[PDB]
């Protein structure tokens, strides 16, 4: 979770809120041919820089049928601003709901786990990490270079509190986040592995100029997909840190 910056509240959402104080998300989507629906979707996605919330995949710029809007708390939460997020398709939308588990990634796996677990309390706040409340710079998720599976870091988790909970159980919250959001599927692991591939490829020449170009291209500019993986790779590598702090000059 690269964390986002929730902007100021927009007007047409409040206008639809006023007319029906008790309404569902489907009511907001169907009303007025969904013009306000796609307007709010564009607002949320522009806030988020067109990157997936928990999955961090390059959301399509042109086609808006590849982007879904979901709620941190299971679906008045249908209208609250502190609940709407934009997520990937999750590998679904080819079928409807009859798909093999253990491969779904972002949110459809969340619903599948909720249904097969029979979780009555849909309030996930305080149970898994919320991207809105996360700090700007968090260490948290580290991954081994062998399989690319993201794993919690005990050292950083033990020295921070999240979602108004004691810092002792923060590691448990991170593990629960991993378990619910299925952030270790084959596709994302392969994507992380090839991100490591392309970080490593430019380093064969040991050309510090091109390496500094890579650091400038990743760290600076608009955030890109798999930002967490890039940050972990940059911090883990000692030479990248030495180049960033000015120890090495070319």
């Amino acid at each position: 979770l690269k964390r986002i910056n929730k902007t100021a509240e927009d007007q047409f959402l409040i206008n639809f809120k006023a007319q029906n104080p008790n309404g569902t998300w489907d009511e907001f989507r169907n009303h007025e041919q969904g013009i306000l629906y796609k307007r709010l979707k564009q607002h949320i996605c522009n806030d988020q820089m067109y990157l997936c919330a928990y999955c961090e995949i390059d959301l399509d710029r042109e086609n808006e049928h590849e982007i879904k809007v979901e709620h941190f708390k299971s679906k008045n939460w249908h209208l609250e601003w502190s609940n709407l997020l934009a997520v990937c398709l999750g590998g679904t939308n080819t079928g409807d709901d009859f798909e093999l588990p253990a491969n779904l990634s972002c949110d459809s796996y969340k619903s599948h786990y909720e249904d097969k677990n029979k979780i009555n309390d849909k309030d996930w706040t305080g149970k898994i990490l919320l991207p809105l409340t996360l700090p700007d710079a968090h260490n948290f998720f580290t991954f081994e270079k062998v399989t690319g599976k993201l794993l919690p870091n005990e050292s950083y988790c033990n020295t921070i509190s999240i979602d108004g909970k004691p810092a002792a159980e923060t590691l448990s919250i991170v593990t629960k986040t991993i378990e619910v959001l299925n952030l270790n599927c084959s596709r994302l692991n392969n994507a992380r592995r090839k991100l490591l591939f392309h970080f490593n490829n430019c380093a064969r020449e040991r050309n510090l100029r091109k390496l500094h170009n890579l650091l400038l291209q990743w760290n600076q500019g608009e955030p890109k997909f798999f930002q967490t993986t890039r940050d972990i790779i940059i911090r883990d590598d000692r030479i990248c840190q030495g180049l960033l702090n000015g120890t090495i000059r070319y």
């Binding site: 590998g91 079928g95 093999l100 491969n103 000692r238 030479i239 030495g242």
Partner: protein, 527 residues
């Protein structure tokens, strides 16, 4: 009558079977406040009998309860796309669904070309062990209309709610029967299920038994849903068709009797040194060859509408041409790379494909009497274990060519190889888990075979038992474990580089990582 009835009548007047059958149902009931009149119902039935230009008859859905090894397997076969790959596993129940469809389809095949009503039900060994409420329910789908059918059984010592209906298929049989006797050229639905028993295909027992019927439309349903591509029927059809075009045959009979006389054998045995008689014997053998050559030359000249059927089997087997038989001791002759040779000595997979395509083509041409394009009919063909005897080159090509040679034919098949199951889109391939049906993940239409194996068949691309695989795993563990040169990376690298070779996209990456690690320990010396 409401204006909707008038609109439906007007639509049905412009060649619409759906509207005709909807008005038939309305007249047979009290729908939309329409007075019950069987006269207009019969008129609508007669109008519909003249509107059967083609409906692409399908099987739509299936409902199984306590059959074989499944409990409840409501499944929706594709309708807009004419294919479905039932992937499953070995022992999960692929053949269960296909067997259910063929038991359902035997009743349909009977009610097309037979009289009375004959069909097969659930036997004693098919009922699930533990409960007795078995039922097969396949909902057919003609062009816009559906006919329910439930095949059910019940143990004598109990009475479940397994009320077998057979309610819908009677209407389909009736409408085809009425449509038959107005113009004896109709596109009857095709029915055929093909088990794995086609392995014992073309052999001498069928060709040698060659030594009539006019091939009516009602024939090709016969011996179709059995499970074997009977080459004997195809050979008989070939002979009957080409016979439409005696002294030589009488000469062959006389020469066989004369040259095989016991007196001639005794004379030959008595005088071994018979060079003068040996010359006459070789002259007789030359006459044998000349007569046989002339008799065969009276054949390989012309053909008939059989050419269209022949073109179907030259596409699936490249390099094959000039399929005739021999008027000498019976055999079928092909030509492979300018090498004429007999069919009995073809490859196993070649014979399998040849028999399969020939049988389907024969069925399709017998059902369709008079058409410019007889080979693209409407029907259902079921294939079990399509990858039985096929090379991987043909496995990724078998289905895309099958859907092209035969257009309006459903091809629900079962596969056991990734190469065949990566030419079909991900929404039309079905996976049978331990007890439930699951859909394939996206990215199968043109994906790599390794991905299909890994995320559709649950098998690792690297055998997780071999010594070399474990050595590679240990090497990949050690390279990233902060000891990239601790003498064991050295040993295992010296082993794996010699084994796999210095140029493979599994060790090149990891050696590049090792080189990067080597570079990483240069500027840190001063630290």
């Amino acid at each position: 009558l409401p204006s909707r009835i008038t609109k439906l009548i007007k639509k049905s007047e412009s060649g619409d079977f759906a509207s005709s059958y909807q008005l038939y149902k309305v007249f047979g009931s009290k729908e939309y406040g329409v007075e019950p009149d069987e006269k207009m119902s019969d008129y609508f039935k007669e109008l519909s009998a003249k509107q059967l230009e083609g409906g692409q008859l399908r099987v739509a859905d299936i409902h199984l309860e306590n059959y074989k090894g499944f409990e409840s397997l409501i499944m929706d076969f594709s309708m807009k796309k004419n294919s479905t790959i039932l992937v499953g596993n070995n022992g999960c129940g692929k053949s269960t669904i296909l067997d259910a469809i063929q038991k359902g389809l035997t009743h349909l095949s009977s009610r097309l070309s037979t009289r009375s009503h004959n069909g097969d039900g659930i036997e004693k060994h098919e009922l699930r062990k533990g409960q007795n409420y078995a039922s097969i329910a396949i909902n057919y789908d003609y062009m816009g209309i559906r006919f329910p059918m439930i095949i059910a059984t019940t143990e004598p010592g109990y009475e479940d709610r397994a009320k077998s209906n057979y309610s819908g298929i009677n209407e389909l049989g009736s409408i085809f029967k009425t449509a038959h006797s107005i113009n004896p050229n109709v596109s009857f639905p095709l029915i055929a299920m093909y088990t794995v028993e086609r392995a014992n295909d073309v052999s001498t027992r069928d060709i040698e038994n060659s030594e009539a019927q006019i091939w009516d439309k009602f024939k090709a349903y016969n011996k179709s849903l059995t499970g074997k591509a009977d080459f004997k029927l195809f050979f008989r059809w070939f002979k009957e068709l080409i016979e439409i075009e005696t002294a030589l045959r009488a000469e062959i009979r006389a020469k066989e009797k004369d040259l095989d006389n016991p007196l001639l054998k005794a004379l030959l045995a008595e005088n071994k040194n018979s060079e003068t008689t040996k010359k006459l014997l070789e002259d007789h053998q030359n006459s044998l060859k000349v007569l046989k050559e002339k008799l065969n030359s009276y054949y390989s000249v012309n053909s008939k509408t059989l050419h269209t059927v022949e073109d179907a089997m030259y596409s699936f087997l490249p390099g094959f041409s000039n399929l005739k038989l021999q008027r000498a001791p019976l055999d079928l002759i092909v030509d492979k790379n300018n090498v004429s040779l007999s069919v009995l000595q073809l490859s196993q997979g070649e014979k399998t494909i040849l028999a399969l395509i020939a049988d389907i083509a024969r069925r399709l041409t017998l059902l369709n009497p008079n058409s410019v394009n007889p080979l693209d009919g409407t029907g259902i063909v079921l294939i079990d274990e399509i990858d039985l005897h096929l090379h991987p080159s043909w496995q990724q090509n078998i289905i895309p060519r099958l859907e092209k040679t035969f257009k309006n034919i459903q091809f629900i098949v079962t596969t056991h190889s990734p190469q065949v199951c990566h030419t079909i889109d991900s929404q039309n391939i079905w996976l049978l888990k331990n007890g439930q049906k699951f859909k394939a993940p996206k990215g199968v239409r043109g994906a790599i075979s390794s991905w299909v194996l890994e995320n559709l068949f649950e098998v690792a691309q690297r055998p997780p038992e071999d010594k070399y695989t474990k050595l590679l795993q240990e090497y990949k563990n050690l390279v990233f474990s902060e000891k990239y040169a601790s003498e064991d990376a050295r040993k295992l690298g010296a082993t794996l580089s010699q084994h796999f070779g210095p140029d493979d996209e599994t060790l090149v990456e990891l050696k590049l990582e090792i080189e990067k690690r080597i570079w990483e320990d240069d500027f840190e010396k001063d630290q």
